[PDB]
Amino acid sequence: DAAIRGNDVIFVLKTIGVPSACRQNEDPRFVEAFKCDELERYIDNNPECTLFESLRDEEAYSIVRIFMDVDLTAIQDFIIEVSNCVARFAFTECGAIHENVIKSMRSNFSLTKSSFHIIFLDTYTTMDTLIAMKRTLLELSRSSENPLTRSIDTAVYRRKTTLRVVGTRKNPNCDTIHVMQPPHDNIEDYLFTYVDMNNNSYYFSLQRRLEDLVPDKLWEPGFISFEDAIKRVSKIFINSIINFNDLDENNFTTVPLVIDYVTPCALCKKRSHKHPHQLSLENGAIRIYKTGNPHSCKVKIVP
Amino acid sequence: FISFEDAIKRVSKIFINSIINFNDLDENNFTTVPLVIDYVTPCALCKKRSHKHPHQLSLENGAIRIYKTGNPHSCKVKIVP
Amino acid sequence: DAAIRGNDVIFVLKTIGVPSACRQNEDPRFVEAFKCDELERYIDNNPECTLFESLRDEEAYSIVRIFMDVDLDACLDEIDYLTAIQDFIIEVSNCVARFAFTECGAIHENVIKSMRSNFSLTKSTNRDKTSFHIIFLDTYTTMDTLIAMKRTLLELSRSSENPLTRSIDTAVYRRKTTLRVVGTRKNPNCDTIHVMQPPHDNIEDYLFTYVDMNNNSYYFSLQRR
Ligand SMILES: Nc1ncnc2c1ncn2[C@@H]1O[C@H](COP(=O)(O)OP(=O)(O)OP(=O)(O)O)[C@@H](O)[C@H]1O
Ligand SMILES: [Zn+2]
Numbered sequence: 001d002a003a004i005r006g007n008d009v010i011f012v013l014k015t016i017g018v019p020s021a022c023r024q025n026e027d028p029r030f031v032e033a034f035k036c037d038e039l040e041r042y043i044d045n046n047p048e049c050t051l052f053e054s055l056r057d058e059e060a061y062s063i064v065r066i067f068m069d070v071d072l073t074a075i076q077d078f079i080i081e082v083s084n085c086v087a088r089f090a091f092t093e094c095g096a097i098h099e100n101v102i103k104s105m106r107s108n109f110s111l112t113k114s115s116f117h118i119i120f121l122d123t124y125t126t127m128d129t130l131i132a133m134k135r136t137l138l139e140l141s142r143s144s145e146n147p148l149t150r151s152i153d154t155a156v157y158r159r160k161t162t163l164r165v166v167g168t169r170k171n172p173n174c175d176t177i178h179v180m181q182p183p184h185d186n187i188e189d190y191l192f193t194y195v196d197m198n199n200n201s202y203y204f205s206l207q208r209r210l211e212d213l214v215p216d217k218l219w220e221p222g223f224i225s226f227e228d229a230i231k232r233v234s235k236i237f238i239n240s241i242i243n244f245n246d247l248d249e250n251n252f253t254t255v256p257l258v259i260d261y262v263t264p265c266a267l268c269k270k271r272s273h274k275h276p277h278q279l280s281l282e283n284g285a286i287r288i289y290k291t292g293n294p295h296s297c298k299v300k301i302v303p
Numbered sequence: 304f305i306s307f308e309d310a311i312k313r314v315s316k317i318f319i320n321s322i323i324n325f326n327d328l329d330e331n332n333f334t335t336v337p338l339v340i341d342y343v344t345p346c347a348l349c350k351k352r353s354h355k356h357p358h359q360l361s362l363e364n365g366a367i368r369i370y371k372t373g374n375p376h377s378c379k380v381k382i383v384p
Numbered sequence: 385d386a387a388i389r390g391n392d393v394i395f396v397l398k399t400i401g402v403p404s405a406c407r408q409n410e411d412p413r414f415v416e417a418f419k420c421d422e423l424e425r426y427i428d429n430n431p432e433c434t435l436f437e438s439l440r441d442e443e444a445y446s447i448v449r450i451f452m453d454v455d456l457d458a459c460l461d462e463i464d465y466l467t468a469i470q471d472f473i474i475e476v477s478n479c480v481a482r483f484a485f486t487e488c489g490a491i492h493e494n495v496i497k498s499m500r501s502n503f504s505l506t507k508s509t510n511r512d513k514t515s516f517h518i519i520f521l522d523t524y525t526t527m528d529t530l531i532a533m534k535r536t537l538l539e540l541s542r543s544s545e546n547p548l549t550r551s552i553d554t555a556v557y558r559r560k561t562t563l564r565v566v567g568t569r570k571n572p573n574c575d576t577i578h579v580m581q582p583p584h585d586n587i588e589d590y591l592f593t594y595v596d597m598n599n600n601s602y603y604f605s606l607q608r609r
Contacts, residue, residue: 017326135344153312155312155316158321158341159321159341215344280463289463298470299463299470364541364542364550365542366550368458375512376459379464380460384545
């Protein structure tokens with residue numbers, strides 16, 4: 001909870017792929033620190049420019065706003081879905097309040113037409129939260145088939161990030177600019193390094209003092225296996241299985257299952273398959289194959 | 304073929320983690336410079352944890368093949384069409 | 385038709401880039417013709433030889449088996465290799481049967497059953513590459529049919545995504561084509577050779593110019609011409 005110290009200075013880079021030599025040395029041709037009033041004057045002075053946004057020092061200050069880049073009812077449902085998805089994490093471990101999050105994210109946003117950028121005015125968090133759930137956003141985009149969710153880019157969440165300033169072209173050769181969308185007019189409504197406190201917003205982070213050590217163990221979360229998938233595995237084998245009595249996701253792969261044969265084999269046409277069978281998981285796909293000589297049987301995949 | 308930006312976007316989508324050498328990639332030397340992945344999370348190809356070697360890309364039959372320098376059995380081969 | 389005509393003589397070139405003039409006169413030091421046992425013995429006495437398999441006269445007898453070559457510069461594990469080979473077999477059979485039903489006038493089920501019935505595979509001694517020649521034993525067609533099928537095979541290789549399917553070389557379907565005999569050196573000073581597989585132990589099953597039609601084989605050819 002920094003609270004007291006307010007971030008109004010904007011850190012701008014003037015070259016994509018800037019050499020690392022004259023970047024931390026405060027080169028006037030690559031790095032500048034401007035404010036609200038000077039930015040439009042600089043834009044007026046230089047008709048052609050390429051300006052990207054960044055942070056002063058990620059180690060010291062890493063407080064940003066939640067933003068998305070996509071490349072009326074559709075966006076109306078998209079905003080609600082995104083708010084619910086992030087509120088799930090906010091209530092998961094953040095120690096925050098879901099009601100505060102949904103109140104903060106409600107009807108307070110901006111739009112930009114070039115592929116559009118969304119920044120939430122009254123939502124402040126720390127960049128490690130953004131780096132934590134790029135995978136969650138990707139999973140949400142993949143699982144759902146919503147119009148605007150299908151093209152969400154999670155590659156923008158990284159360290160030393162860059163966000164193109166509205167009205168600044170990628171290159172002088174290109175003729176594509178960001179057209180500002182009403183009712184927002186001032187540049188301060190499109191600055192993801194801008195921080196304020198208006199006795200209505202909310203701040204959330206991991207809040208349990210982790211140094212990006214959240215992943216403790218990802219035990220292949222296909223533990224719906226209670227009777228859905230494991231019964232499918234027992235369905236492909238017509239003959240009875242004896243080790244089926246007690247199974248768990250912990251011993252899901254390590255145990256060599258031994259079955260009994262009274263009718264000829266299911267996967268192939270052989271006799272009793274003396275070497276025990278075995279199971280593996282890859283890319284969320286269940287794989288079944290025979291130990292010893294795998295060429296004496298057939299590998300079967302179950303989604 | 305497709306634009307180089309689209310292919311790079313697909314490659315960066317395949318790799319969940321970020322690339323710290325993204326700016327060095329170009330349309331003429333995208334098969335020689337090794338790629339280093341910031342290993343905060345396991346790579347999507349093979350889980351393991353925090354590989355200690357860079358990756359590389361090859362162009363064949365209109366597809367991009369991702370292969371890891373060193374022992375080939377460590378990381379699974381991936382093809383982007 | 386062919387009826388009695390069943391090829392059993394193996395025509396072989398002993399040197400890549402054979403002179404054109406020498407071939408027309410059957411030069412002994414570049415051109416030979418054996419049987420199966422004669423070829424096996426000739427390879428046995430001389431393990432340093434370099435032999436290629438090709439036809440002699442394409443205007444009189446042009447009946448060959450279906451053959452494919454796969455070469456990928458990436459090692460694979462056992463289970464992934466097995467899954468890839470199964471998918472490759474299924475997709476190749478589907479594509480070939482579709483072409484046979486569309487442009488040749490054959491029957492889809494017979495072609496696909498004949499192709500999945502018997503097939504032979506090889507392997508390379510290289511520890512970093514996956515290369516193999518696959519020959520379908522019970523399917524027969526003319527060379528021009530394969531030349532026509534080249535476009536469909538190229539389209540299938542471009543469209544697919546399996547590591548083995550993307551490595552199909554369609555350049556082998558050319559006039560006056562040659563194929564390397566298994567167990568025989570490619571370069572005079574290279575130790576990389578091909579090896580057989582446990583299901584098949586005879587060389588007769590590894591040559592695409594050997595024709596012997598039993599009751600389980602299928603034959604088809606182009607009908608538009
Ligand atoms: N480390 C990285 N830094 C920046 N972009 C990266 C990185 N890794 C992968 N990428 C991808 O490369 C793409 C190239 O960025 P670029 O600025 O050209 O995109 P754009 O579609 O024009 O975006 P915008 O809508 O923000 O103007 C990014 O959109 C992103 O998907
Ligand atoms: Zn890996």
